[PDB]
């Protein structure tokens, strides 16, 4: 649901690259690029990067259950 | 409901020990070195260093199970010599031989970072 | 003792005794969550 | 968490109950130090004659070098696996998505160069 | 019947990675030196979780799970602490753990990024790595306004044998024989194969020829660190290690044959 904090392959941290992916995407890189910019350079970690569902955002869409 | 726990890998149990020798009967001057709670990490430099003397006629190691954690060497010296001795000898080179490899990486770390 | 309930709809803390309709007093919503627990429950992170 | 016995599957028939887990040092590892998360067994590929799976895994590899999402709709010519070989050729692999892989027990190279790669797996 | 005696060179040091070749070992050592990069080189991670509150979409094994896996720096206090079973203490002393506390609240309208940067310690020591003074902060959760995470973690000693959170690199290239001069690999079209990046070989020469007297020199490494240890702090841990285990079964030897 969220992006994982290790690589499950090599164990690389890449909990702390989500968002700097995405703004990365939306400032016009190719995703190809973006991971150069990361610096994940394993197909592992660019698996885990271009991969992920962010499902926690729809997740984060529905009211907690206390106010 | 069955896992072990990830220790059991490397913690002894009570009243078990690191490592028992026993007499190999087939052939002369052989013994079974059983080390519990060790790996293909110990036994295949154990075995590569025994190898290397020119003293020992068999050298070789086994997990017999992966699931145990347990490994066999087995080691076959000439008759002048001995398998515990070799065993020995094998350990003390190994150490030996890592310890200069730290020292020298430690003075590659300090070229590198000065210069 | 007071086994206090959170409302399914309007999220509101209000405590039901035993032999009482489920109720939330706020908005009359009648499907209630418990609060988590105070015990300590204890996690490997593994 | 998966554990011996439970049931994993590809997208192409391709299920088997895990056998044994091994850790990161246990597992063959390529010369970049990049070790399997899954090892199937090659002969459940010839009887079966699952070659998506094969173009599916060649695929991947391509994707996760180039930063895309393979494109794998059944019927399309503009889709062969020349192309995606060439592709990977260009990402400094071998063209058929084999590896030279060390054995992790004794970091000794494998003889038969080992055909690795992204697949999409499924626990069932 | 003797020691090698190994060089090492040292071809980049990095803060994210030590690049080095060692010559004149065995095949063993360097493979066994390559796994205890992997699996007996000590560091502190979270291996106990007490959620005392969690409104988060994340279930609490969830976020334990995650808490686990943020490298803390481990550089000169994780040589001090003691394994918990080493210590003579209760469950916990700041001799054998590190204490972590994590208190988020999200009031405010926008979507709050709980990180490793909320993850506040009792020794400044160790620390999360992200959170160590560029590359963002770990994300733990993300909390919509009303949700709530608090927490309290103790880091322990351990290595990647028991958990790969207790693992302190983030991949270990390894190589040897660049050249396919051993021909420990057999190519059935070597022309096909891209050449390493070791190599010293003419592009047009495939593989090096074969040397039937050759032996497993000069092995490359590659190790990059996860952010608990340095790389270098890493190999020098890994070595230390393994001589202390070996030390340790040439005791236990000595006992056994002594008995005898
Ligand atoms: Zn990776
Ligand atoms: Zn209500
Ligand atoms: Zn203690």
Same mark, same amino acid.
């Given at each position: 649901?969220?992006?994982?904090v290790?690589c499950?392959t090599?164990?690389?941290?890449?909990?702390?690259?989500?968002?700097?992916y995405?703004?990365?995407?939306?400032?016009?890189?190719?995703?190809?690029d973006?991971?150069?910019?990361l610096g994940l350079?394993?197909?592992?970690?660019?698996?885990?990067?271009?991969?992920?569902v962010?499902?926690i955002?729809k997740?984060?869409?529905?009211?907690?259950?206390?106010? | 409901?069955?896992?072990?726990?990830?220790?059991?890998?490397?913690?002894?149990?009570?009243?078990?020990?690191?490592?028992?020798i026993?007499?190999?009967?087939k052939?002369?001057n052989?013994?079974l070195?059983?080390?519990?709670?060790?790996?293909?990490?110990?036994?295949?430099?154990?075995?590569?260093?025994?190898?290397?003397?020119?003293?020992?006629?068999?050298?070789?190691?086994?997990?017999?199970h992966?699931?145990?954690?347990?490994?066999?060497?087995?080691?076959?010296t000439?008759?002048?010599?001995?398998?515990?001795?070799?065993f020995?000898?094998?350990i003390?080179?190994?150490?030996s031989?890592?310890?200069?490899?730290?020292?020298?990486?430690?003075?590659?770390?300090?070229?590198?970072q000065e210069? | 003792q007071?086994?206090?309930?959170? !409302? *399914?709809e309007?999220?509101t803390?209000?405590?039901?005794?035993? =032999?009482?309709?489920?109720?939330?007093?706020? !908005? *009359?919503?009648?499907?209630?969550?418990?609060?988590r627990?105070? =015990?300590?429950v204890?996690?490997?992170?593994? | 968490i998966?554990?011996?016995?439970?049931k994993?599957?590809?997208?192409?028939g391709?299920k088997?109950?895990?056998?044994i887990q091994?850790?990161?040092?246990?597992?063959?590892?390529?010369?970049?130090?990049?070790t399997?998360?899954i090892?199937?067994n090659?002969?459940?590929?010839?009887?079966?004659?699952?070659?998506?799976?094969?173009?599916?895994?060649?695929?991947?590899?391509?994707?996760?070098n180039?930063?895309?999402?393979?494109?794998?709709?059944?019927?399309?010519?503009?889709?062969?696996?020349?192309?995606?070989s060439?592709?990977?050729?260009?990402?400094?692999?071998?063209?058929?998505?084999n590896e030279?892989?060390?054995?992790?027990?004794?970091?000794?190279?494998?003889?038969?160069?080992?055909?690795?790669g992204?697949?999409?797996?499924?626990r069932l | 019947?003797?020691?090698?005696?190994?060089?090492?060179?040292?071809?980049?040091?990095?803060?994210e990675?030590?690049?080095?070749?060692?010559?004149?070992?065995?095949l063993?050592?360097?493979?066994?030196?390559r796994?205890?990069?992997?699996?007996?080189?000590?560091?502190?991670?979270?291996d106990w979780?007490?959620?005392?509150?969690?409104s988060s979409?994340?279930?609490?094994?969830?976020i334990?799970?995650?808490?686990?896996?943020?490298?803390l720096?481990?550089?000169?206090?994780?040589?001090?602490?003691q394994?918990?079973?080493?210590?003579?203490?209760?469950?916990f002393?700041?001799?054998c753990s590190v204490?972590?506390?994590?208190?988020?609240?999200?009031?405010?309208?926008?979507?709050?990024?709980v990180?490793?940067?909320?993850?506040?310690?009792?020794?400044?020591?160790v620390?999360?790595?992200?959170?160590?003074?560029?590359?963002?902060?770990?994300?733990?959760?993300?909390?919509?306004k009303?949700?709530?995470?608090?927490?309290?973690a103790?880091?322990?000693?351990?290595?990647?044998?028991?958990?790969?959170?207790?693992?302190?690199?983030a991949?270990?290239?390894?190589?040897?024989?660049?050249?396919?001069?051993?021909?420990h690999?057999v190519?059935?079209?070597?022309?096909?194969?891209p050449?390493?990046?070791?190599?010293?070989?003419d592009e047009?020469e495939?593989?090096?020829?074969?040397?039937?007297?050759?032996?497993?020199?000069?092995?490359?490494?590659?190790?990059?660190?996860?952010?608990?240890?340095?790389?270098?702090?890493i190999?020098?841990?890994a070595?230390?290690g393994?001589?202390?285990?070996?030390?340790?079964?040439?005791?236990?030897?000595?006992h056994?044959?002594?008995?005898?």
């Amino acid at each position: 649901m969220i992006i994982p904090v290790r690589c499950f392959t090599c164990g690389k941290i890449v909990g702390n690259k989500w968002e700097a992916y995405l703004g990365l995407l939306q400032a016009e890189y190719t995703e190809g690029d973006a991971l150069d910019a990361l610096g994940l350079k394993r197909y592992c970690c660019r698996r885990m990067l271009l991969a992920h569902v962010d499902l926690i955002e729809k997740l984060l869409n529905y009211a907690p259950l206390e106010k | 409901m069955n896992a072990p726990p990830a220790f059991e890998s490397f913690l002894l149990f009570e009243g078990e020990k690191k490592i028992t020798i026993n007499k190999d009967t087939k052939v002369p001057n052989a013994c079974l070195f059983t080390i519990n709670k060790e790996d293909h990490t110990l036994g295949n430099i154990i075995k590569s260093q025994l190898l290397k003397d020119p003293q020992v006629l068999f050298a070789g190691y086994k997990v017999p199970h992966p699931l145990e954690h347990k490994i066999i060497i087995r080691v076959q010296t000439t008759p002048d010599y001995s398998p515990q001795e070799a065993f020995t000898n094998a350990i003390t080179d190994l150490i030996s031989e890592l310890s200069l490899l730290e020292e020298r990486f430690r003075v590659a770390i300090k070229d590198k970072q000065e210069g | 003792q007071p086994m206090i309930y959170i !409302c *399914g709809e309007c999220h509101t803390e209000n405590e039901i005794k035993s =032999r009482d309709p489920i109720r939330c007093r706020e !908005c *009359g919503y009648r499907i209630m969550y418990k609060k988590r627990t105070k =015990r300590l429950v204890v996690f490997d992170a593994r | 968490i998966p554990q011996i016995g439970d049931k994993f599957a590809s997208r192409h028939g391709q299920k088997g109950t895990c056998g044994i887990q091994y850790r990161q040092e246990d597992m063959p590892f390529t010369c970049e130090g990049i070790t399997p998360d899954i090892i199937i067994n090659p002969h459940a590929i010839p009887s079966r004659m699952t070659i998506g799976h094969l173009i599916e895994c060649l695929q991947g590899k391509v994707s996760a070098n180039k930063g895309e999402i393979g494109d794998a709709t059944p019927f399309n010519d503009a889709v062969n696996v020349q192309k995606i070989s060439n592709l990977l050729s260009d990402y400094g692999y071998h063209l058929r998505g084999n590896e030279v892989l060390y054995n992790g027990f004794t970091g000794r190279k494998i003889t038969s160069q080992i055909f690795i790669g992204p697949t999409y797996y499924q626990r069932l | 019947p003797y020691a090698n005696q190994p060089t090492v060179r040292i071809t980049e040091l990095t803060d994210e990675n030590v690049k080095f070749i060692i010559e004149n070992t065995d095949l063993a050592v360097a493979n066994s030196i390559r796994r205890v990069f992997i699996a007996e080189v000590p560091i502190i991670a979270i291996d106990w979780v007490q959620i005392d509150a969690n409104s988060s979409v994340l279930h609490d094994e969830f976020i334990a799970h995650r808490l686990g896996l943020i490298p803390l720096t481990s550089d000169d206090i994780v040589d001090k602490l003691q394994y918990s079973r080493d210590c003579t203490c209760e469950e916990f002393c700041p001799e054998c753990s590190v204490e972590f506390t994590l208190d988020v609240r999200c009031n405010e309208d926008q979507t709050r990024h709980v990180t490793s940067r909320d993850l506040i310690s009792n020794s400044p020591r160790v620390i999360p790595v992200t959170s160590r003074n560029e590359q963002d902060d770990i994300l733990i959760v993300k909390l919509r306004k009303g949700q709530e995470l608090r927490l309290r973690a103790y880091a322990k000693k351990g290595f990647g044998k028991e958990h790969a959170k207790w693992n302190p690199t983030a991949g270990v290239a390894f190589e040897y024989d660049p050249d396919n001069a051993l021909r420990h690999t057999v190519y059935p079209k070597p022309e096909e194969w891209p050449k390493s990046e070791y190599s010293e070989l003419d592009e047009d020469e495939s593989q090096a020829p074969y040397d039937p007297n050759g032996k497993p020199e000069r092995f490359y490494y590659n190790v990059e660190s996860c952010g608990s240890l340095r790389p270098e702090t890493i190999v020098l841990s890994a070595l230390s290690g393994l001589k202390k285990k070996l030390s340790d079964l040439q005791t236990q030897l000595s006992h056994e044959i002594q008995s005898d």
